[PDB]
Amino acid sequence: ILGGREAEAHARPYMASVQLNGAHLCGGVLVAEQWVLSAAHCLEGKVQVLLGAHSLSQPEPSKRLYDVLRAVPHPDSQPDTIDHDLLLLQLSEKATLGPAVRPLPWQRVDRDVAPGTLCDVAGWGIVNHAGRRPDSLQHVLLPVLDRATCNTERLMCAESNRRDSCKGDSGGPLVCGGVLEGVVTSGSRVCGNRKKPGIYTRVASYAAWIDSVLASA
Ligand SMILES: CC(=O)c1cccc(CC(=O)N2CCC[C@H]2C(=O)Nc2cccc(Br)n2)c1
DSSP states (O other): OBSOEEOOTTSSTTEEEEEETTEEEEEEEEEETTEEEEOGGGOOOOEEEEESOSBSSSOOTTOEEEEEEEEEEOTTOOTTOSTTOOEEEEESSOOOOBTTBOOOOBOOSOOOOOTTOEEEEEESSOSSTTOOOOSBOEEEEEEEEOHHHHOOTTEEEEOOSSOBOOTTOTTOEEEETTEEEEEEOOSOOOOSOTTSOEEEEEGGGGHHHHHHHHHOO
């Protein structure tokens, strides 16, 4: 997160760190007891998911790491494209739920969020252009852009004027009126430059796919 603030410990109880050989790689969103949604290129052998966390290193009563049982990228995702950039991860067991670990409802109705609406993006991605990795969760509020300024029906844009998502925030949520609307893209892009808006996959565009994966296993 660039130009943001430190999040309040555990106030975003859906927030997941998606980790690869022990280190944070991507954000994620607890959407059911045993399913975290992230982005497709968050994949590249040993994948895990930390729930209930504010600090990645420090001891917290709610922190729980989990093994991943199944990794389901969207079938139409490609390693070199930003389309269909979703990934579902089934956890090893169902998450121990509490005030600090709670699934986030996702938008099932396929209407765009109103342009100008500020939505909340949280993550452990880089906080500057030198690559600094924060210990504790960060967030920033970002105004949503109309479709034509964005320029897919399946993607949505947010302003990137200093305040922005960046490397390592990929796969984490964009939240608007307490509902998940967006998942941060996992393709490379310049951050912090108002002329290159943030890109987030509209989850409502993929209600059929998600369900069809959350039916099973
Ligand atoms: C969303 C966006 O603005 C943006 C910009 C540039 C780059 C990216 C891509 C991105 O992040 N990834 C690609 C898949 C792995 C993940 C990553 O590289 N994870 C990571 C690496 C080092 C430190 C940290 Br913390 N995380 C997104």
